[PDB]
Design a protein around this nucleic acid. Structure first.
Ligand SMILES: [Zn+2]
Lengths: 392, 615
DNA sequence: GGGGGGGGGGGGGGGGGGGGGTTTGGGGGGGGGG
DNA sequence: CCCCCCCCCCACCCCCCCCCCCCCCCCCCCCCC
């Protein structure tokens, strides 16, 4: 029964070596596939009788003299040459699994393990996967042995064109689908109705530029960040960012190393992941000059540019923008132009298809309407309003 | 003398010792039957016994001093006698461990000296540089392809044995004497866990103008991961030299000393100089009897931090955070956060940090800080690992953040995800994922320059943005009031503290640093355990439902706050409304009440109005 | 007068022995705040 | 517009190899048929 139990990585002790255990964790890194020799085939130059060496370790030493009876009986010291055509290779790949961040005891470093996977089971894993893996827990030559898990079986943790008619036949689907966008958020149905059109999109023709963009602006709060996150959930090919957030690969692209090792690579930011899709910029007012010129290049070329380390290149970034320009100094002055309240230049704002300024006005009547909605959602736990027909 | 001759006498003498003190035999059988029962129905205890050096002294002083001074000759026969005893019990090597009265062999990494080599020693210290656990090969088993026999080989190094034996150099044999090829058998082959830990001297003991010394303990199998970095520990083991020490002819420089170690026999963490509590019928009765009284929200909160002058509303708010609000997953699993977050702005020297101590020692699953999650790397890692910050570690727990004004930009930018989404997102090295960080936070902060200016906002006295400060449900400002009654009280407490004279010291005698190693011979306010048991019982027994009369008080108070002059102090908004719902729910959890009702909202709104507006 | 056998030189194989295999400070460039 | 900050960049076993020794083979010379 022991193979059935999913062990966390730090429960894998030395006594398990040789057993077909099952482990649980997150894959923090994955190798590119490379071939490994099962059997080397050598041709013999002076007799043509091939010979074979099987390999059963991380290293080997190649053969030199023809050991075959064809040469050996003739005492003919022929020379051996490796053939990749005739050698049997197997696909090899390595992945580093780490215990889940929740499993780490208080103060300990998260423990990790090498998984080796061979044959057709290769490229069943990817970084960020949370997964259960069966394998043989094994030593390797470094008395302290190196150790790894030989993977054997994997459990990842994670018609339509007829089925659309079920909603079409019910009618008024635009109004209802817009009302299905974040039903837990009060009112603002005209804004939701526009935000839906950004997912649906216009025409691109030849060029004619087809993406649709909206800026929300004005006082902080009013469930706006949740609305942007909800759009990222609802929409296909969506991504959520902030003007300073997503601070790893970033919203703005660059050439990069993997400084944990020594190689270099070019990789895209969020605006490339949002390609053929939609990007949501929270804290939009706070993004820097490189970020602003990045969204400029989305709107002006539908690309993001590279000009570094001898590489000049533009990466494709066809994408809708949803944006949230919350003002300076904590609150908008609700009778002024936005440029007296917002950091961003009006040039950038002019490229958006629509801009919605919304103010968090204290007004007893609208306060009670909003508060009745919020308190009802908290009280009832279901159907954030009636007759909205919230589609999943 | 040749040890092998007297080995039998030492075995039978330790067997007589084991018979004389039968509690060791009883412990051996207790371990065996526990392991048998865990095997019987699909946890395992180790083959280790802690023997008292006092018992062994009273039995045979000559054998006892042999164990202390010559463990390389006296431990192996004693462990052989123990193994024979365990084998004599009905249906693998057993190990010894030691406790008590080491005398001159009670040491620290400073006073551990070359005179002590190969003696049994106890070292008082602090753990640093815990290595990764590695499996160490000690027996390799091999099926012979044609011969049929299972050949094997045992292995030796300077750490696996208490006495010197020729090292066996880490090679698997692959051929029989007859030349037949061998296939190595994992599982049947035996590997022991192996770990190195660097015990540092306690810095309190280190004398004037000296760095703390340190030494490497070696730990095998069931002693591995007994401790983590920073643990104050007492280790017992044999102090040893190893290696060639530059006597080997490669080394022109022979001034280098020999490497030295302790081979560990036991690891005692010194936690003392309940995370989930037991509950007796007395506790069940008195918890429920107390819950029917009205002033519990005063008495329980005032039982927090009883040394603190004033700050009743702060203690009440702390109690509501400890009994925080209920989670709301709506339809489609749409998540809204029930947890509560608090921030104590103010002067230094106020109650803040001491309140964080009292909260930290009262709460459970509580993390001390002075964040989020990260992708990280270190000196020896040729690899990157995903790390948990305090909020991830406090998932469904609490975080205590002192000096929160000091936190750096990459942290503060990502705190928004904790505050809005109760989660944190990773965005580099292809680990694009999101982690649960569903905690209730209490933070404290100081002015960045000068004393706190009570006219200026928290956004102005401290560099933290208003768009960050506004995330917290409750935002207190505390200040060092110069009240003579308070000052008289705390002054006399501090004077009584500084008049303390330790036991048996003469008047004016200086306190000696020698202490802990020299003694290394091994108004109805409630108790904090009772308060813990009450909050545990509340979390254990109720999830209050939200009644409409509560809603009517809540919308009344929110729309009042959002249209009274309180608007001129703060732009009161939707976050304040859901905060009122959380705080009223928390007060229902104070009551243990099956529902939230109008009474809870009336308390919560008074506290929130005080916290934000001071009234 | 040619072929076998004896004796000496030269080359190749096999064995044995031996050696090698990250922190701290400083200047200059580049960007941001008063 | 000017100055300060902060960021970057840089300093014991096993294999290959070589040396030494011994045997075997091949050629030359002399004798026998
Ligand atoms: Zn050949």
């Amino acid at each position: 029964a022991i193979s059935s139990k999913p062990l966390s990585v730090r429960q894998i002790k030395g006594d398990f070596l040789g057993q077909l255990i099952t482990v649980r964790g997150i894959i923090t890194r994955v190798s590119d596939v490379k071939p490994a020799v099962e059997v080397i085939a050598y041709t013999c130059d002076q007799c043509g009788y091939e010979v074979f060496q099987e390999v059963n370790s991380r290293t080997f030493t190649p053969l030199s003299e023809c050991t075959s009876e064809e040469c050996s009986q003739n005492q003919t010291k022929g020379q051996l040459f490796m053939s990749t055509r005739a050698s049997k290779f197997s696909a090899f790949q390595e992945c580093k699994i780490q215990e889940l961040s929740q499993q780490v005891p208080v103060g300990h470093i998260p423990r990790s393990l090498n998984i080796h996977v061979n044959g057709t089971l290769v490229r069943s894993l990817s970084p960020g996967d949370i997964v259960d893996v069966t394998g043989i827990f094994l030593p390797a030559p470094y008395l302290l042995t190196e150790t790894y898990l030989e993977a054997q079986f994997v459990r990842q943790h994670k018609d339509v064109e007829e089925r659309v008619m079920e909603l079409i036949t019910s009618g008024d689907v635009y109004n209802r689908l817009a009302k299905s966008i974040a039903p837990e958020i009060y009112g603002n149905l005209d804004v939701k109705k526009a935000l839906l059109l950004l997912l649906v999109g216009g025409v691109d023709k030849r060029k004619i530029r087809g993406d649709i963009n909206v800026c929300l602006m004005g006082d902080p709060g009013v469930a706006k960040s949740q609305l942007l996150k909800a759009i990222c959930k609802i929409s296909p090919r969506g991504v959520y960012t902030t003007g300073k957030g997503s601070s790893g690969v970033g919203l703005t692209a660059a050439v990069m190393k993997d400084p944990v090792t020594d190689e270099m690579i070019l990789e895209g930011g969020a605006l490339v992941l949002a390609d053929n899709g939609i990007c949501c910029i929270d804290e939009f007012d706070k993004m820097d000059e490189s970020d602003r010129t990045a969204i400029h290049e989305v709107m002006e070329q539908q690309t993001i540019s590279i000009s570094k380390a001898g590489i000049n290149t533009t990466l494709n970034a066809r994408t809708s923008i949803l944006a949230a320009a919350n003002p300076l100094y904590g609150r908008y002055n609700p009778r002024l132009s936005p440029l007296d309240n917002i950091n961003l230049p009006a040039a950038l704002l002019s490229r958006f298809d629509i801009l919605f300024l919304m103010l968090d006005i204290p007004s007893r009547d609208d306060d009670e309407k909003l508060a009745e909605h919020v308190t009802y959602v908290h009280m009832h736990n279901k159907q954030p309003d009636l007759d909205f027909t919230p589609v999943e | 003398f040749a040890p092998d001759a007297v080995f039998g006498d030492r075995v039978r003498r330790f067997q007589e010792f084991l018979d004389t003190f039968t509690s060791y035999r009883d412990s051996v059988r207790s371990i065996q039957v526990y392991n048998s029962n865990n095997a019987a129905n699909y946890n395992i205890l180790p083959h280790r016994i802690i023997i008292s050096l006092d018992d062994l002294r009273e039995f045979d002083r000559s054998f006892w001093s042999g164990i202390l001074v010559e463990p390389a000759y006296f431990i192996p026969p004693a462990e052989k006698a123990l193994t024979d005893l365990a084998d004599s019990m009905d249906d693998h090597p057993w190990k010894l461990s030691f406790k008590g009265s080491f005398g001159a062999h009670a040491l620290s990494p400073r006073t551990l000296t070359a005179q002590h080599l190969n003696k049994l020693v106890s070292v008082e210290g602090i753990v640093t540089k815990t290595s990764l656990v590695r499996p160490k090969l000690i027996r390799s088993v091999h099926y012979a392809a044609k011969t049929g026999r299972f050949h094997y080989r045992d292995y030796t190094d300077a750490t696996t044995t208490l006495t010197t034996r020729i090292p066996t150099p880490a090679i698997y044999p692959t051929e029989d004497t007859e030349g037949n090829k061998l296939t190595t058998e994992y599982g049947y082959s035996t590997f022991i866990d192996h770990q190195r830990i660097t015990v540092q001297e306690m810095p309190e003991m280190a004398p004037a103008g000296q760095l703390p010394r340190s030494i490497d303990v070696i730990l095998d199998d069931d002693l591995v991961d007994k401790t983590k970095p920073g643990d104050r520990v007492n280790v017992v083991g044999v102090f040893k030299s190893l290696g060639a020490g530059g006597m080997n002819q490669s080394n022109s420089n022979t001034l280098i000393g020999f490497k030295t170690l302790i081979l560990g026999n036991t690891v005692y963490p010194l936690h003392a100089r309940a995370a989930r509590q037991m509950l007796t019928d007395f506790d069940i009765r008195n918890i429920n009897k107390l819950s029917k009284k009205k002033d519990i929200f005063d008495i329980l909160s005032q039982s927090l931090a009883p040394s603190i002058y004033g700050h009743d509303h702060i203690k009440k708010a702390i109690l509501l955070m400890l009994m925080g609000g209920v989670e709301k997953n709506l339809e489609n699993g749409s998540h809204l956060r029930g947890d509560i977050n608090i921030l104590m702005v103010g002067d230094p020297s106020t109650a803040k940090s001491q309140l964080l101590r009292f909260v930290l020692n009262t709460a459970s699953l509580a993390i001390a800080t002075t964040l989020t999650a990260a992708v990280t790397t270190d000196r020896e890692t040729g690899e990157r690992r995903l790390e948990a910050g305090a909020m991830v570690l406090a998932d469904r727990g609490v975080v205590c953040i002192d000096e929160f004004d000091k936190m750096t930009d990459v942290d503060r930018v990502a705190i928004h995800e904790v505050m809005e989404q109760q989660t944190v997102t990773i965005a580099k090295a292809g680990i694009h994922t999101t982690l649960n960080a569903r905690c209730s936070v209490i933070a404290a902060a100081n002015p960045v320059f000068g004393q706190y200016d009570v006219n200026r906002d928290p956004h102005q006295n401290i560099a933290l943005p208003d768009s960050l400060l506004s995330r917290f449900d409750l935002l207190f400002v505390v200040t060092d009031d110069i009240n003579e009654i308070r000052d008289r009280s705390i002054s006399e407490h501090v004077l009584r503290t500084h008049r303390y004279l330790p036991p048996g010291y003469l008047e004016g005698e200086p306190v000696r640093e020698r202490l802990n190693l020299s003694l290394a011979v091994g108004p109805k306010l409630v108790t904090i355990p009772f308060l813990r048991k009450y909050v545990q019982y509340a979390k254990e027994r109720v999830i209050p439902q939200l009644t409409q009369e509560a809603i009517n008080v809540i919308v009344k108070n929110y729309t009042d706050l959002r249209n009274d002059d309180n608007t001129k102090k703060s732009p009161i908004t939707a976050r304040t409304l859901e905060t009122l719902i959380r705080l009223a729910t928390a007060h229902a959890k104070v009551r243990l009440s099956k529902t939230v009702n109008k009474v809870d909202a009336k308390v919560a709104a008074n506290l929130l109005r005080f916290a934000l507006l001071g009234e």
